[PDB]
Amino acid sequence: HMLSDEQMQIINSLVEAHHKTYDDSYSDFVRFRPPVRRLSMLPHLADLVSYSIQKVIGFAKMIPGFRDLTAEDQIALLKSSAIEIIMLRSNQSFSLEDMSWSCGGPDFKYCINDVTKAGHTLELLEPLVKFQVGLKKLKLHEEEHVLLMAICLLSPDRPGVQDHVRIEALQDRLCDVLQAYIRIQHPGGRLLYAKMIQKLADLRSLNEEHSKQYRSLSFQPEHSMQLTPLVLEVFGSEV
Amino acid sequence: HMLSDEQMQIINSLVEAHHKTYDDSYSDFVRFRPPVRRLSMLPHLADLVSYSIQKVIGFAKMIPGFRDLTAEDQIALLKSSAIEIIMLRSNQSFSLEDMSWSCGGPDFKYCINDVTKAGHTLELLEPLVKFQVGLKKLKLHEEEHVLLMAICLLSPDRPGVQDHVRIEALQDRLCDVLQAYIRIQHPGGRLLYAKMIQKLADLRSLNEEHSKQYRSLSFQPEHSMQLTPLVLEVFGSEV
């Protein structure tokens, strides 16, 4: 057996959307408030995350079917999955040699400690690094990585989603595209699909922990003032 | 005649508050989103203005009497005068040689054109530069400049102020301190006080124009997203 034209077009559109919304040089990082090493890394990391939300929105808008959902479902899906898509996309900068995200030079090399200086704890950072190491070891094809992000985004089990039948259908269409890609194009991927679906479960708990820690930060006006309007809106409680 | 102990203590406290909230080296400017020359200067200038609001709050809290007003009057006074205090304090960086604010190097030298790239027009920038030139020519003593800022801050004629009798009294106490300072300590200041009070009238119209232009910017989410939580709150319409 082989992939159909429709399945192939889905892969093409997703890979192109990722190439359009992810810069491997990290050249836009010089435009953020600079890194500093009380929560010295918060301005830089808030700017980094704000920039990445914009990219995730860019990517999302090109996922086949996403543009057809209501502005409400689009927002509900973006709000609840943004941090998970940010965690997935960050894997491309993660290095197993130094257990860090390497984004250009000495300034943009981020370790656990730097994120601690952004108001985060090891209750989040220890499983994040473990998730990063695990996902990195899966040696995903660009097609699988892009499909995993789109699958994550289109999870119907999110607070605020209204049309859980239409989102579940788009997600299943994407899950079949992934399953077939691994079967046809990935030699030795016999257990990959399962391992990948298990990574989405990991993201849910990482998401829960981030939200808790973010709520703490967002409630202290001296820290919330260092965030951006986009971060506040996306990670905020408004309906 | 001469200044009294009380009048002298007011001058001492104000000069000290300004020395504590104004850096002549402009060394904190490297921590802002960098200058870029669609509204390329907005991130840098929003960060600059956000930083300056913080300083104006710092200064305000040390103006004798201000701390005794209700949190409501303190907010109402800060909200409506912030841009005027920013305009006054910026005079210390204004240069008559190049008609610009020189804050360190080639990156932090700001001309009319740069502010145009922050969503502002010559309807604001032409009278601003004319105001800057005029105030600069007054060759104010540090004591007069600090008194002018405090006088501006304590203007009772502001939207939202409740105790206009207590604010008017603090402002008059400050106006007498200024009048006496010029009389005793400023040789040739016979017409200075009037010229200074006239600069406050200028600030009202400059404030009105800035608010109009800012409302335009704040209504476009692509521009409002580049502002900071502090700028949005201070220049915002909430009561």
Partner: peptide, 10 residues
């Protein structure tokens, strides 16, 4: 509300 997100989604 969600003013920014609405704009960014066009």
């Amino acid at each position: 509300r969600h003013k920014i997100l609405h704009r960014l989604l066009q």
